[PDB]
Tab-separated table of C-alpha atoms in Angstrom:
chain	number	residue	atom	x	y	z
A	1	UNK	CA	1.617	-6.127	16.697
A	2	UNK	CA	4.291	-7.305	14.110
A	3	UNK	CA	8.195	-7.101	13.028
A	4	UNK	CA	8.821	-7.475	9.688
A	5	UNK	CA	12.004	-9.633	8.984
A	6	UNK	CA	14.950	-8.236	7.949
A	7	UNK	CA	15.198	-10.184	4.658
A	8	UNK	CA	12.647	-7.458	3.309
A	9	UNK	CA	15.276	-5.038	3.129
A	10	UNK	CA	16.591	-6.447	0.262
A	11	UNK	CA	13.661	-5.868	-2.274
A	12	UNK	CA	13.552	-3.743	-5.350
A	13	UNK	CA	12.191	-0.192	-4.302
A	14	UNK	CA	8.642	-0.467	-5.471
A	15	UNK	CA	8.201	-4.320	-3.826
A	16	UNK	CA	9.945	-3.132	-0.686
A	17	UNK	CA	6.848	0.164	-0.594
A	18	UNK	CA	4.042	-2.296	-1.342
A	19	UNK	CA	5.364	-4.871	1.618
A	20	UNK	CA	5.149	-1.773	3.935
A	21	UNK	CA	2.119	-0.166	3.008
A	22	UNK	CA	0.219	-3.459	2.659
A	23	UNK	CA	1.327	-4.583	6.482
A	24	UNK	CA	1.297	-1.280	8.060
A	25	UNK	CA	-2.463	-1.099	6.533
A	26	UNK	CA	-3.327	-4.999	7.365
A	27	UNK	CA	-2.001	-4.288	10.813
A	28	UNK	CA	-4.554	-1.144	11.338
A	29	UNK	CA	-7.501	-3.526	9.665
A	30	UNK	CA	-6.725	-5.921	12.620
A	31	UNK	CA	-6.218	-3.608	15.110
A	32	UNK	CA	-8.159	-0.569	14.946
A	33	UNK	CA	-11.895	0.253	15.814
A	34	UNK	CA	-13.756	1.900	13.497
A	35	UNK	CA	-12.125	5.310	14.788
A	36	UNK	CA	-9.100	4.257	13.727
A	37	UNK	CA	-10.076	2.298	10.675
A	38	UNK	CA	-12.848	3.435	8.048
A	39	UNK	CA	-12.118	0.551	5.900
A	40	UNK	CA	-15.828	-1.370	4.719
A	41	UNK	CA	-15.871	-5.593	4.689
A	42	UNK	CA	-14.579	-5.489	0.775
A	43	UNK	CA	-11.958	-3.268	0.729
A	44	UNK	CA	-10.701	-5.374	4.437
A	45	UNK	CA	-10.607	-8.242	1.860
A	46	UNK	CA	-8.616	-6.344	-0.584
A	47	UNK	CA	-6.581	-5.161	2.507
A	48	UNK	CA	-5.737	-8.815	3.340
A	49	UNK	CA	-5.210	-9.564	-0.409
A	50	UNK	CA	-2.431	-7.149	-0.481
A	51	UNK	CA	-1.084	-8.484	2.511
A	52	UNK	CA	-1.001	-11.965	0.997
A	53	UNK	CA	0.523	-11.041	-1.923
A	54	UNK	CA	3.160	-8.617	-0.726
A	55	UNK	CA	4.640	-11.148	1.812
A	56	UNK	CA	4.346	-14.407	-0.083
A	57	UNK	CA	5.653	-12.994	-3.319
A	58	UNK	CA	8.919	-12.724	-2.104
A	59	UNK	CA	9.257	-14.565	0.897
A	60	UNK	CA	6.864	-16.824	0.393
A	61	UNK	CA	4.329	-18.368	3.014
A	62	UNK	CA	7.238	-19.069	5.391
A	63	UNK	CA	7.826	-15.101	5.352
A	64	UNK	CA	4.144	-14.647	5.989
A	65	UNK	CA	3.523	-16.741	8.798
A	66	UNK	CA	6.577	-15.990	10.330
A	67	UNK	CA	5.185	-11.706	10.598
A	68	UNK	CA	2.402	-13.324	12.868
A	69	UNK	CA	-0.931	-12.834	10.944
A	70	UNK	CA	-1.242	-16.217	9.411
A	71	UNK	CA	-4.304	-16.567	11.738
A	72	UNK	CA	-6.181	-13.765	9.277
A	73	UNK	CA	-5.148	-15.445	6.196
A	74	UNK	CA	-5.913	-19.095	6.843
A	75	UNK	CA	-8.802	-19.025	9.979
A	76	UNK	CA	-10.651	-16.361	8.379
A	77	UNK	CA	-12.622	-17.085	5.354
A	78	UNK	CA	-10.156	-15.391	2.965
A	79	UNK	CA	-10.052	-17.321	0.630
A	80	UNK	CA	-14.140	-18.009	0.707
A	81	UNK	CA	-14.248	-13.897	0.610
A	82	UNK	CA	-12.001	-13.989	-2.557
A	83	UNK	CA	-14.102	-16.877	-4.606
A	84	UNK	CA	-17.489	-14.419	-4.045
A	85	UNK	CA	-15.384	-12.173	-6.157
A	86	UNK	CA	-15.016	-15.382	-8.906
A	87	UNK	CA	-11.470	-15.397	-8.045
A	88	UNK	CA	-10.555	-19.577	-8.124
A	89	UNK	CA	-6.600	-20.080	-8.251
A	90	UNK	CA	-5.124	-18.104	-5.279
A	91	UNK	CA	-8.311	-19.608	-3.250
A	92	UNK	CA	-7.204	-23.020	-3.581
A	93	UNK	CA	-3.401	-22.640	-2.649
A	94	UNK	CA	-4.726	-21.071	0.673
A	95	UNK	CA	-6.719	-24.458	0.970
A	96	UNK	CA	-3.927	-26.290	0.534
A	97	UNK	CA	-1.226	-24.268	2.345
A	98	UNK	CA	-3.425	-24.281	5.362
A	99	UNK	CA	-3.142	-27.623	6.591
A	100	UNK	CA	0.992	-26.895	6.226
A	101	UNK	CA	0.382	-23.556	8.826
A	102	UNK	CA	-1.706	-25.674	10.479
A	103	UNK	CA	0.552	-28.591	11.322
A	104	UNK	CA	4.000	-26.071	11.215
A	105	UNK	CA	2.491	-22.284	11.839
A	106	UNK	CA	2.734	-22.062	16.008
A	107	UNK	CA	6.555	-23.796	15.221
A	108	UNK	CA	7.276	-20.989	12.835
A	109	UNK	CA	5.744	-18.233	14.780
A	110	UNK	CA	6.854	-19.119	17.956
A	111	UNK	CA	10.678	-19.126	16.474
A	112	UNK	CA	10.871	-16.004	14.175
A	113	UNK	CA	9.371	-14.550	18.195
A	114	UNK	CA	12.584	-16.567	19.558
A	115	UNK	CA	14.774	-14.611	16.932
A	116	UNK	CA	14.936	-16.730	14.315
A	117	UNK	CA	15.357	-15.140	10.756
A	118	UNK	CA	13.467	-16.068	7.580
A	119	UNK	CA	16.554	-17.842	5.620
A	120	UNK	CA	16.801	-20.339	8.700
A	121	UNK	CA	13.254	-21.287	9.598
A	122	UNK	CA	12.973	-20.906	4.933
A	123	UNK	CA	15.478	-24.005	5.221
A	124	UNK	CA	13.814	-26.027	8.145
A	125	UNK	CA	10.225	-25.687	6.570
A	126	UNK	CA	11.077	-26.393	3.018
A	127	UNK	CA	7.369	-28.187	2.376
A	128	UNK	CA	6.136	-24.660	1.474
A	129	UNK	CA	8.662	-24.037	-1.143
A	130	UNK	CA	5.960	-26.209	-3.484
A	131	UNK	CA	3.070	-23.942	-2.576
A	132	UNK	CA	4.676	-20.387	-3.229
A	133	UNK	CA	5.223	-21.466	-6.368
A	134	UNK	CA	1.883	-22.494	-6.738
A	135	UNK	CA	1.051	-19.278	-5.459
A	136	UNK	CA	2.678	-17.193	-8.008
A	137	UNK	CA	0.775	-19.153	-10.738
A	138	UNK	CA	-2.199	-18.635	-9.408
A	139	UNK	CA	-1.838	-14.930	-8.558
A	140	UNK	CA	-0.500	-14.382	-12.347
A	141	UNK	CA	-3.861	-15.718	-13.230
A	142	UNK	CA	-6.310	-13.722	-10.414
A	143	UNK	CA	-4.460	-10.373	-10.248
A	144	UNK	CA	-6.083	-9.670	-13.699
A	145	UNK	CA	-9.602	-11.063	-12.691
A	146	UNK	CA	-9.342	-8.657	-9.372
A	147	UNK	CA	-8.320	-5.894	-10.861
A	148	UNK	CA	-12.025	-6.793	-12.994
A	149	UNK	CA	-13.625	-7.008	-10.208
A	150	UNK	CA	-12.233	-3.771	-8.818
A	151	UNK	CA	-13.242	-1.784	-12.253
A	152	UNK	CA	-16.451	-3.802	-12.240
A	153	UNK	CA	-17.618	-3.046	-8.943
A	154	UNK	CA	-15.850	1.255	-8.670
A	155	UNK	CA	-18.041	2.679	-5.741
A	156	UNK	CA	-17.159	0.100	-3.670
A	157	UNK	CA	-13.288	0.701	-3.909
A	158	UNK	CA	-13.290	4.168	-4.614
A	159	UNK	CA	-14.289	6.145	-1.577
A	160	UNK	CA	-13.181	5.767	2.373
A	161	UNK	CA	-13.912	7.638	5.119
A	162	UNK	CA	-16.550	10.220	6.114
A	163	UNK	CA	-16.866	13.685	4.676
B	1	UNK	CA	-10.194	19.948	6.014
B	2	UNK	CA	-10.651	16.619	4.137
B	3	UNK	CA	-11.727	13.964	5.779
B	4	UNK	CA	-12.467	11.452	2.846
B	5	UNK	CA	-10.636	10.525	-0.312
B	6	UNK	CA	-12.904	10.092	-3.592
B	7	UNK	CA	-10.227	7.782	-6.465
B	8	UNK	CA	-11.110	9.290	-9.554
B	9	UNK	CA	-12.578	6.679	-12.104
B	10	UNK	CA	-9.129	7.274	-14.340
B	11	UNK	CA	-7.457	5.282	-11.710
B	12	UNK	CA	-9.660	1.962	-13.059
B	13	UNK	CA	-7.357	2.271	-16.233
B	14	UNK	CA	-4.132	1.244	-14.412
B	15	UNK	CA	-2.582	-2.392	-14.585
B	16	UNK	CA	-3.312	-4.948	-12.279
B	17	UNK	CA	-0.308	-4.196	-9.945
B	18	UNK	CA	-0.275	-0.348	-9.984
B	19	UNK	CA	-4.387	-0.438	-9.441
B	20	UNK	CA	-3.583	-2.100	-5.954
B	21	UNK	CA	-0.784	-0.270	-5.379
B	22	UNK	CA	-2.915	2.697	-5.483
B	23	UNK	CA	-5.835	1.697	-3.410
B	24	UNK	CA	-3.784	0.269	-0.664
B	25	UNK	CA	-1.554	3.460	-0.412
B	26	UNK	CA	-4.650	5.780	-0.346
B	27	UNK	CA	-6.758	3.353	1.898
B	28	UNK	CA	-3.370	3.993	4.540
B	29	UNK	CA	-2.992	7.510	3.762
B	30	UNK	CA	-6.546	8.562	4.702
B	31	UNK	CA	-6.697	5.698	7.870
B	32	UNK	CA	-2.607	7.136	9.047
B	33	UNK	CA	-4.038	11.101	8.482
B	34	UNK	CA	-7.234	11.105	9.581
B	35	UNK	CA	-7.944	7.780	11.819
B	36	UNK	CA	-4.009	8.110	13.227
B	37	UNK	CA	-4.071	11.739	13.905
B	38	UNK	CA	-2.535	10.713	17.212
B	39	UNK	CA	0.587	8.734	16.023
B	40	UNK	CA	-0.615	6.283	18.270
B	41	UNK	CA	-0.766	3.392	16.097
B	42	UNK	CA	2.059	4.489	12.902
B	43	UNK	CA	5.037	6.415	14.486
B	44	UNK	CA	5.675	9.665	12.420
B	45	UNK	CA	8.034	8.043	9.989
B	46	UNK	CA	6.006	5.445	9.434
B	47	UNK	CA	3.032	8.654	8.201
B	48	UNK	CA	6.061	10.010	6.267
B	49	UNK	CA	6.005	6.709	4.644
B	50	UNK	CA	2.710	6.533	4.033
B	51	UNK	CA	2.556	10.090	3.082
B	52	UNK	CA	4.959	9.496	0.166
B	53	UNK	CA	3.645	5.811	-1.035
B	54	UNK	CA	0.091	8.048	-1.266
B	55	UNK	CA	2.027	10.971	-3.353
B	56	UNK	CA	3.729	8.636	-5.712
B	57	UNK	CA	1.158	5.903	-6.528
B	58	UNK	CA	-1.358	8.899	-7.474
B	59	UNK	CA	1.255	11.037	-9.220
B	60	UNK	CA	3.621	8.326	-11.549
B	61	UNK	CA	0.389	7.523	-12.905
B	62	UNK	CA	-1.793	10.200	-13.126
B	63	UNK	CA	-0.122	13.468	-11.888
B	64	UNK	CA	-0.167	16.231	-9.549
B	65	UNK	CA	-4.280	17.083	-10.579
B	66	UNK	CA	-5.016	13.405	-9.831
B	67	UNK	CA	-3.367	13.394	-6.531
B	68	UNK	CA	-5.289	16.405	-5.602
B	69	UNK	CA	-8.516	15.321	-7.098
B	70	UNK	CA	-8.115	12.285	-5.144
B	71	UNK	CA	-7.630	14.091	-2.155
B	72	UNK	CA	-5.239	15.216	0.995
B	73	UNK	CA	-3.174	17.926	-1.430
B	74	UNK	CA	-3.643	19.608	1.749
B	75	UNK	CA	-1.624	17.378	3.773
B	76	UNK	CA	0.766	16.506	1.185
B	77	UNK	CA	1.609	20.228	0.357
B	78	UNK	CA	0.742	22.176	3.675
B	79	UNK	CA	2.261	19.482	6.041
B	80	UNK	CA	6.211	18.998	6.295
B	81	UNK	CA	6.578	15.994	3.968
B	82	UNK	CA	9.651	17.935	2.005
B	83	UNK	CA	11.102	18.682	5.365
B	84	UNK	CA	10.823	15.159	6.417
B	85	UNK	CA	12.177	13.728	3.381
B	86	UNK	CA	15.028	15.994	3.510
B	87	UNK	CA	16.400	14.675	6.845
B	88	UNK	CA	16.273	11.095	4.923
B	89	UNK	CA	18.836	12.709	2.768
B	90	UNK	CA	15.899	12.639	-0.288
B	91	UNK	CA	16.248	16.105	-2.322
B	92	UNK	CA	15.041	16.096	-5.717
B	93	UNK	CA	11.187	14.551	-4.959
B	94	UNK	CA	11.350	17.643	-2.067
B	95	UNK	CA	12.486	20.325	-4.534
B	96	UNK	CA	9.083	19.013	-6.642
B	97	UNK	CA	6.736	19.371	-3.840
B	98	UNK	CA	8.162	22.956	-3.218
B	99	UNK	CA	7.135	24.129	-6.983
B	100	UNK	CA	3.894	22.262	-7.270
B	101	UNK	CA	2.932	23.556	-3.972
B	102	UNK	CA	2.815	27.188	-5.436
B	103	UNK	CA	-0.010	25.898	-7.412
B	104	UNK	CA	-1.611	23.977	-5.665
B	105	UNK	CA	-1.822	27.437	-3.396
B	106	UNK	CA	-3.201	28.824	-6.700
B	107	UNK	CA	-5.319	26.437	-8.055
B	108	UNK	CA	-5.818	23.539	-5.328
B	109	UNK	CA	-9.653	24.559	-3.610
B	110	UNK	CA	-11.062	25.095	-7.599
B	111	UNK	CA	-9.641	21.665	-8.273
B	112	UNK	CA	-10.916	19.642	-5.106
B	113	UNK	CA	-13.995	21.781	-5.894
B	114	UNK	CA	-14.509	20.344	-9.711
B	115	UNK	CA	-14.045	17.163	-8.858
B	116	UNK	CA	-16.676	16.913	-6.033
B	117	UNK	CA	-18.808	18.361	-8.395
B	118	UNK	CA	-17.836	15.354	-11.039
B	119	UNK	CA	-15.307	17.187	-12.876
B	120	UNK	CA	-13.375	13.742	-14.452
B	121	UNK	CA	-9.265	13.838	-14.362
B	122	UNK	CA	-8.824	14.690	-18.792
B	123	UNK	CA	-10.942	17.799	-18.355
B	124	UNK	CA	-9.173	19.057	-15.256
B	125	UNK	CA	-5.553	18.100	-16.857
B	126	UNK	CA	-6.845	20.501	-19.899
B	127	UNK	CA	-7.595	23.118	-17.283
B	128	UNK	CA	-4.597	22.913	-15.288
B	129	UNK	CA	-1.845	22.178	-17.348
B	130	UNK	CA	0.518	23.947	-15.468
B	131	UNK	CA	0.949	21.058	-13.238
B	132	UNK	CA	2.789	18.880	-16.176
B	133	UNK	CA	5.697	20.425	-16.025
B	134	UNK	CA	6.030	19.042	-12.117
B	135	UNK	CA	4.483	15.583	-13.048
B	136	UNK	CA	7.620	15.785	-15.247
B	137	UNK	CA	10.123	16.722	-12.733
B	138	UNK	CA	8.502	14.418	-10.195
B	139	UNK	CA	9.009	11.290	-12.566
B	140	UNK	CA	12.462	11.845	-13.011
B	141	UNK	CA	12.869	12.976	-9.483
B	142	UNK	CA	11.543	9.662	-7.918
B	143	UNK	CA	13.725	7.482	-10.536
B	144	UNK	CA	16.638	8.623	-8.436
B	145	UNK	CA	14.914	9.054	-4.877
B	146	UNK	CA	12.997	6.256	-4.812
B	147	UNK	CA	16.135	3.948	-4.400
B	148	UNK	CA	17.532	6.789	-1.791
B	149	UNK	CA	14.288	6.029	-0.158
B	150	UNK	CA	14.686	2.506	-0.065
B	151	UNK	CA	18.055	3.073	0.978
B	152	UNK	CA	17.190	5.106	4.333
B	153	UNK	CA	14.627	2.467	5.083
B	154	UNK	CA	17.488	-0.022	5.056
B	155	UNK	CA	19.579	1.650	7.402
B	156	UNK	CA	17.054	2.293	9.932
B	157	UNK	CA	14.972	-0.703	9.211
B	158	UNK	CA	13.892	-0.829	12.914
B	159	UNK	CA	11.900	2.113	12.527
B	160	UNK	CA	9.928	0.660	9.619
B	161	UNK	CA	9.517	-3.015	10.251
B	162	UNK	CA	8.380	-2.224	13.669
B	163	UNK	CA	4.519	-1.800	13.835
B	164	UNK	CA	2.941	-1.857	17.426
């Protein structure tokens, strides 16, 4: 289950719709049996992508962990899934943000359960502030070469569910 | 009744940020209609959410035949989304959806029907031009209500940042 934090609220229109759609969709990825969920392995890697991207974009890996789900971006092979696709830069900030959720993720998660909002825990954990950066310079780079992969590879991404 | 959702190839055109846009929105919208049919996982305004996202990524970029090419006119059109965007205090998109679902009364089965046969999104634009004049409406509409939107999510932002 997750709560979004209330800094959210604040984002232009359009970033505000892609934070929701991309959580309430990574939350049925997690959740849901294949009744619920038709989604095939790639397009659960886009699904995660999305999720990524949407949180850290604007509140950065803080925000992320802090929803809960850090466990399905850093312990599974997310950012092993994304190099099969030839995608390098976003890859290697997971790497390196991991061993920061490693050493400070139960902290964070176990406040923002506790109550604690995103500007507060933002200003205890401030050793991520280097890595969202680095995350928006690498995702200025691989959102191009996804999209590529996504033209490049159509059947794949184009169809869900069972007619 | 559809059951599946088929992105036309047109969609591979779009930029970077709108391509995921529209994949994630559709992914939801068939997994919230058709794997959530009992509102046990998204509450109903979170499928009203979903509902729109699906109806805007596929129509601000390639119209009211894409959208129903795609797939789920049905439940975009026959189901109250006008009606439920109307209690968030959201008129103009609704006043759209009441016009273009005339047509898609008209026209909507021949359309689904080309493009499962492999009818591509140009050729049925050609055919069913009538639509335009809604994509129109619908652009301008959503320039206003899309901020409205994000306004009522604000206010009640329990009901959308809650997912359990």
């Amino acid at each position: 289950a997750l709560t979004l934090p209330e800094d959210i609220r604040q984002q232009e229109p359009s970033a505000l719709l892609y934070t929701l759609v991309s959580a309430y969709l990574e939350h049925t990825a997690q959740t849901g049996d294949e009744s619920l969920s038709c989604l095939s392995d790639d397009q659960h890697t886009l699904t995660a992508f999305c999720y990524l991207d949407s949180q850290v974009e604007e509140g950065g890996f803080v925000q992320l962990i802090a929803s809960g789900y850090g466990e399905y971006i850093f312990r599974n092979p997310l950012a092993d899934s994304l190099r099969r696709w030839k995608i390098k830069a976003v890859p290697k900030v997971l790497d390196k943000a991991k061993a920061l959720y490693e050493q400070h993720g139960k902290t964070i998660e176990t406040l923002a359960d506790g109550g604690a909002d995103i500007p507060s825990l933002r200003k205890q954990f401030p050793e991520f502030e280097e890595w969202d950066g680095a995350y928006y310079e690498a995702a200025e780079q691989d959102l191009p070469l996804l999209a590529e992969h996504i033209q490049s590879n159509w059947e794949t991404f184009a169809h869900i569910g069972q007619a």
